[PDB]
Amino acid sequence: EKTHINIVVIGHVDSGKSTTTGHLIYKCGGIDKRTIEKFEKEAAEMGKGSFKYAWVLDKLKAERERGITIDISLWKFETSKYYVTIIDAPGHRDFIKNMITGTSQADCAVLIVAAGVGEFEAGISKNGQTREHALLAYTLGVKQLIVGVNKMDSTEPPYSQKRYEEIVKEVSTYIKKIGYNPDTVAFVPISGWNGDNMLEPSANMPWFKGWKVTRKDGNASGTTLLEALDCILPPTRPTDKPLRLPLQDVYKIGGIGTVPVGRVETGVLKPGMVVTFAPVNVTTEVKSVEMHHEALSEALPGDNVGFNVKNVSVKDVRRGNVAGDSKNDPPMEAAGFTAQVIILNHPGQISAGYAPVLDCHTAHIACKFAELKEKIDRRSGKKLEDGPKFLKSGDAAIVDMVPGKPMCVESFSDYPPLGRFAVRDMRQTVAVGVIKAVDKK
Amino acid sequence: FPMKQGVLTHGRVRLLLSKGHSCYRPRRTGERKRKSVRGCIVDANLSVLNLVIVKKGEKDIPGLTDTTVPRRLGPKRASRIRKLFNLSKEDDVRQYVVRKPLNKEGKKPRTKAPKIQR
Amino acid sequence: SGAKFRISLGLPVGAVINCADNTGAKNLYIISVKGIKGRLNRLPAAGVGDMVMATVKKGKPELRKKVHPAVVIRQRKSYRRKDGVFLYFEDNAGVIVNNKGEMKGSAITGPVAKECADLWPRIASNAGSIA
RNA sequence: UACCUGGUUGAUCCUGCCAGUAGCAUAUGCUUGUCUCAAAGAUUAAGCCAUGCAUGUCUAAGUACGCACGGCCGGUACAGUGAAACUGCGAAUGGCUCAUUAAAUCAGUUAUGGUUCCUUUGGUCGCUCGCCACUUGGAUAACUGUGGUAAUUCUAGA
RNA sequence: GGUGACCACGGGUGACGGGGAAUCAGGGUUCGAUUCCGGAGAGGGAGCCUGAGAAACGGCUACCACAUCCAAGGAAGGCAGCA
RNA sequence: AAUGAGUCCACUUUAAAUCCUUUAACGAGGAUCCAUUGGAGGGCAAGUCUGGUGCCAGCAGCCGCGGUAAUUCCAGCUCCAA
RNA sequence: CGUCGCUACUACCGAUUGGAUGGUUUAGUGAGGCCCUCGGAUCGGCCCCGCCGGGGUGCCCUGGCGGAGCGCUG
RNA sequence: GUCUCCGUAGUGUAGCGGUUAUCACGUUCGCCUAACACGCGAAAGGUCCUCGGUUCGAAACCGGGCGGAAACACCA
Ligand SMILES: [Mg+2]
Ligand SMILES: [Mg+2]
Ligand SMILES: [Mg+2]
Ligand SMILES: [Mg+2]
Ligand SMILES: [Mg+2]
Ligand SMILES: [Mg+2]
Ligand SMILES: [Mg+2]
Ligand SMILES: [Mg+2]
Ligand SMILES: [Mg+2]
Known part of the structure; x- marks a missing residue:
């Protein structure tokens, strides 16, 4: 055998991300019936009954009390074609850095779109996040995604054809501007809470014939979201390049020490091999490697793996570092990068x-701009002006950068997933950039 | 939880079970372990009930009173075969033992007899 | 949903009840009861499942000279439970919570009344048994 | 290697301490090419522990009707190799740590004519007058089958 | 009655005891958790089965403090052994 | 001219390896294949050198040095001890 | 040389029938094991003996159903 | 992670949606003295932690992010 991919569910607040994810997990052999029955028992006890499927991933007390997705959570479910682990994005401008983190370690994206009256329009707006999530997924480097339309029973009248066609048109008109091809993007009308059009073809909505995709590699046409999950093309995994591990989270488990968990971007991770972390510059030897409560001997690229490094505390290595092989070229601090x-x-x-x-x-x-070198056209790296005084929306530019807090970055030519980055300000997306050059220490 | 004879209650109790009482085999010599046992009085709250027919009825129960499975292996003690075959004293005791015929496909057929004792 | 029925209160203002959680407090001195409008000369009284304002008289010194929200979990006064059952407990006990309902502590010693358990989910999770 | 030197005063003899000086024993800093030995979570927390292992055992010489293999030499209790299990022995040694403990532990000395002792070794085992002995009775393992519990090195019935 | 200025009794110990170690005119002063011997303990106490030998804890029973699984009816714990 | 420290075949070692000792072949002229740690007023071996600082920064176990010509600070050079 | 005034630091007294953490204990309650005195859920033997039976010759050598002697026993 | 509060000359830190100011110093600083010291004179000194929104314009009205300062949770 089975190949590993990563999927992120992105969309608007209250559009049904965690509920849809949890029910997809439950239908795909995630957890037995009585665990989810106890979950529903708890959900009824406080009051938030419809959030029971959201609880399979929203495990924290604060998330469960507020009924709000705060932090990224992982869960595994084996599908017809291959293994998949799902990234549950928060869906809030308050936790936008959290979903940027989550979207980075994912190969595909499921763009959940609400269909009920009012919620869709509120999602697609200047204060909405359905624009933002799709734009940042393209910024961070997720090529192939899927748009799923949820809450078909909420809209009036339920399971409407005109509503779904309008949603598909309005999503397509903007996803063309973002960059994804709606001919390659699959559109799936679903209902996570009811469990409609997910594992088996629907009976409440016979009007939906079936989505189709037109890619160069292979053409697919399924009926349910699972068939769409299987048809996702395998990513190109750069196994020969030197290993890099952007760190997701740090845990201090009883008896096995501090186990960094992060996605394998390049190289292969194996037990018994010394690693270095770029920002804190600490050397340590890897004891063992596992994934999703299962051990590994070889950790292939694009895998969320948890490995036990020796004699480093929980505080010394924190969220945001980059791990790498000590024998091969290591990630080093970037004093500046163009x-x-x-x-x-x-x-x-x-x-x-x-x-x-x-x-x-x-x-x-x-990070702080030191100076702006050249004003560059919107594509192809075509030089326009030397040394601009100021920059404005609707233009590209090469810029040299001096971070205030220490950070490690790598070029887009050496490691393509490392090179992707985004720029945020004014509580919005202000710029999209990639790194070509970088100065080490 | 199995039931134990002599508990004289309905429900579950905790008993310090020694060697050879019931519901317990000792891991090491002299070990006694406290265990939960169901009382001897049977009521509604049981999974199974063991019942052993003492006397035959008027007709045959299908699948129970038919196709009498034999006891596997006969008596091994010399006196225990003398009782079973009414031997007086040393009357072909060697050849009056029960021989077990075993047959397997690749096996070349053979009879099996036990090392008779005493 | 379902609302709590009326029960016999039996714990007026000034009652000292046991502190059943592991906060380090030993008793709770009830100074008022939440949701009591009142009546001339009538003491505000609380039953099981009632939120009260209490001060701990003996216990850890960092809890003593303060006012805490508490919830009564056991009462000695018999009360009817709508099925002909008159139930009472061995002692009057409550736990320290906040205004949102979750306990300051993490464990409860002894049983918790079913009325309190049904009305406060966070108390019911830490309840060892429900009577 | 039985050793001193600077500092109170304008200067001098003292008292006297401070400081210097050398070793080892913990930590730490800097540095480090070879080779032989070699300590190593004692000091604070005898604080808390995931996981894995650390105590099992058969000779000709206690009990094999498991086919689980197999010589049969073919009219025979048991050839033999042997799983499992019963029985016997071991598991009270070793290893770890130093919390407790101030005539207590412990060291040397002496006694048990005031005691027990698996095993080894050596004695003793016809010393007793008193309708199976050419060998007595019953049960239970392993094994077959029916199960119960979410679960355990849990076990029940036949 | 017995013991005490020949220091009882009580308290402290950053006390396990000893063989020993450091220092080295002689005399001494400090250190001995640490591989050998003896003792004690197995999270804190307590009580027992078996066995020649245990108040055993890689045996059991109960309480206390921690703490594992659970379908919440129960079940299972003891690295001051090697890692 | 002579050698190792290293590369490295084999033997040897060893339960199997490793290391040591043997032994092929490469392996040194800034032999750049680079010795460091603390000091240079006294105690206490070693500069009344030069450039900065100017009772500041700092040094200094103790006496003490530093307030514009510092044998004592920060540095270069040169010396001292192991 | 001392008071007084300013600034630091260190201890002391001090209402608060102060507070916290250990240790040893009185008293009360008291799990569990062990011992004793009972107890008797069950499991076996004898008396089996309603009988067919019976051989040294109704007088049984007993090869079994069966009641149960409704006692004596372990 | 989740909340709660604090964060303005170098410190002391008032504040007002039309103004971050002053104060005590600290320093600088003419000012003496060989040097002090003693006085004498003046000055500087603020992104209101920080970045935003609101707003005719806001440190402050609102929100974030960052630190601290408290809790509360946090077990592949
Ligand atoms: Mg025999
Ligand atoms: Mg009145
Ligand atoms: Mg024995
Ligand atoms: Mg001690
Ligand atoms: Mg010792
Ligand atoms: Mg010893
Ligand atoms: Mg012991
Ligand atoms: Mg013990
Ligand atoms: Mg010099």
Whole structure:
């Protein structure tokens, strides 16, 4: 055998991300009936009954009390074609750094779109996140995604054809501008809470014939979301490149010590081989490797793996570092790096010096412009002007960067998933950039 | 939880079970372990009930009173075969033992007899 | 949903009840009961499942000279449970919570009345047994 | 290697301490090419522990009708190799740590004519007058079958 | 009655005892958790079966403190052994 | 001219390896294949050198040095001890 | 040389029938094991003996159903 | 992770949606003295932690993010 991929569910708040994910898990042999029965018992006890499927991933007390997805959670379910682990995005502007973290370690994306009256329009708006999630998925490097339309029973009248066609049209008209091809993007009308059109073809909505995709590699046409999950093309895994591990989270488990967990971007991880962490510059030897309560001898790229490094505390290595092989070339601190940012939506003028938060791979650290070298056209790296005084939305530019807090970044040519980054300010997306050059220490 | 004879209650109790009482085999010599046992009085709250027919009825129960399975292996003691075959004293005791005929496909057929004792 | 029926209160203002959680407090001195409008000369009284304002008289010194929200979990006064059952407990006991209902502590010693368990889910989770 | 030196005063003899000086024993800093030995979670927490292992055992010489193999030499209780299990022995040694403990432990000395002792070794085992002995009775393992519990090195009935 | 200024009794110990170690004119002063001998303990106490030998804890029973699984009816714990 | 420290075949060692000792073949002229740690007023071996600082920064176990010509600080050079 | 005034630091007294953490114990309650005195859920033997039976010759050598002697026993 | 509060000259830190100011110093600083010291004179000194929104314009009205300062949770 089985191949490993990663999927992230992105969408709007209250559009049904965690409930849909939990019910997809339950239908695909995730957890037995009585565990979810106890979950529903608890959900009825406090009051939030419809959030019972959301509880399979939203395990924290604060998330369960507020009924709000705060942090990224993992769960595994084996499908017809291959293994898959799902990234549950929060879906809030308050925790946008969290979903940037989550979206980075995912190969595909499921764009959950609400269909009920009012919720869809509120999602697609200046304060909405359905624009933001799709834009940042394209920014961080997720090529193939799928758009799923949820809450078919909520809309009036239930299971409407006109509603679904309008949703598909309105999603397509903007996803063309973002970059994804709706001909390659599969559109699936689903209902997670009811459990409609997910594992078996529906009976409440016979009007839906079936989605189709037109890719170069292979053409697919399924009826349910599971058939769409299987038809996702396998990613190109760069196994020969030197190993890199953007760190997701740190845990201190009783008796096995501190186990960093992160996605394998390049290289292969194996027990008994010394690793270095770029930002804190600490050397340590790997004891063992596992994944989803199962051990591994070889950790292939694009795998969420948990490995036990020896004699490093929980505080020394924290969220956002990059791990790598000590024998091969290591990730080193980036005192400065020349980045190619394209300004998307910034009201005020851009001068050299304002400090937005720049998120490279998993972590988020603000950085300051030192000087703007060249004003560059919107594509192809075509030079337009030398040394611009200020920058404005709707333009690309090569820029040299000096982070305030220490950070490690890698070029887009050496490791393509490392090179992707986004820029955030004004509580919005201000620029999209990739790194081409970087200075080490 | 199995039931134990002599508990004289309905429900479950905890008993310090020694060697050879019931519901317990000792791991090491002299070990006694406290265990939960159901009382001897039977009521509604049971999974199974063991019942052993003492006297035959008027007709035959299907699948129970038919196709009498034999006891596997005969008596091994010399006196225990003398009782079973009414031997007086040393009358072909060697050849009056029960011989077990075993047959398997690849096996070349053979009879089996026990090492008779005493 | 379902609302709590009326029960015999038997714990007026000034009653000292046991503190059944592991907060380090030994008793709770009830100073008022939540949701009591009142009546001339009538003492505000509480039954099981009632939120009260209480001060601990003996216990850890960092809890003593303060006012805490508490919930009564056991009472000695007999009360009817709508099925002809008159139930009473060995002692009057309550636990310290906040205004949102979750306990300051993490464990409860002894049983918890079913009325309190049904009305406060966070108390019911830490309840060892429900009577 | 039985050793001193600087500092109270304008200067001098003292008292006297401070400081210097050398070793070892813990930690730490910097540095480190070879080779032989070699300590190593004692000091604080005898604080808490995931996981895995650390105590099992058969000779000709107690009990084999498991086919689980197999010589049969073919008219025979048991050839033999042997799983499992019963029985016997071991598991009270070793290893770890130093919390408790101030005539207590412990060291040397002496006694048990005031005691027990698996095993080994050596004695003793016709010393007793008193209708199976050419060998007595019953049960239970392993084994077959029917199960119960979410679960255990849990077990029941036949 | 018995014991005490020939220091009882009580308290402290950052006390396991000893063989020994450091220092080294002689005399001494400190250190001995640590591989050999003896003792004690197995999270804290307590009580027992078996056995020649245990108040055993890689045996059991109960309480206390921690703490594992659970379908919440129960079940299972003891690294001051090697890692 | 002579050698190792290293690369490295084989033997040997060993339960099996490793290491040591043997032994092929490469392996040194800044032999750049680079010795460090603390000091240079006294105690206490070693500079009344030069450039900065100016009772500041700092040094200094103790006496003490530093307030614009520092044998004592920060450095270069040169010396001292192991 | 001392008071007084300012600034630090260190201890002391001090209402608060102060507070916290250990240790040893009185008293009350008291799990569990062990011992004794009972107890008797069950499991076996003898008396079996309603009988067919019976051989040294109704007088049984007993090869079994069966009641149960409704006692004596372990 | 989740909440609660604090975060303005170098400190002391008032504040007002039309103004971050002053104060005590600390320093600088003419000012003496060989040097002190003693006085004498003046000054500087603020992104209101920080970035935003609101707003005719806000440190402060609102929100974030960052630190601290408290809890509360956090077991492949
Ligand atoms: Mg025999
Ligand atoms: Mg009145
Ligand atoms: Mg014996
Ligand atoms: Mg001690
Ligand atoms: Mg010792
Ligand atoms: Mg010893
Ligand atoms: Mg012991
Ligand atoms: Mg014990
Ligand atoms: Mg010098």
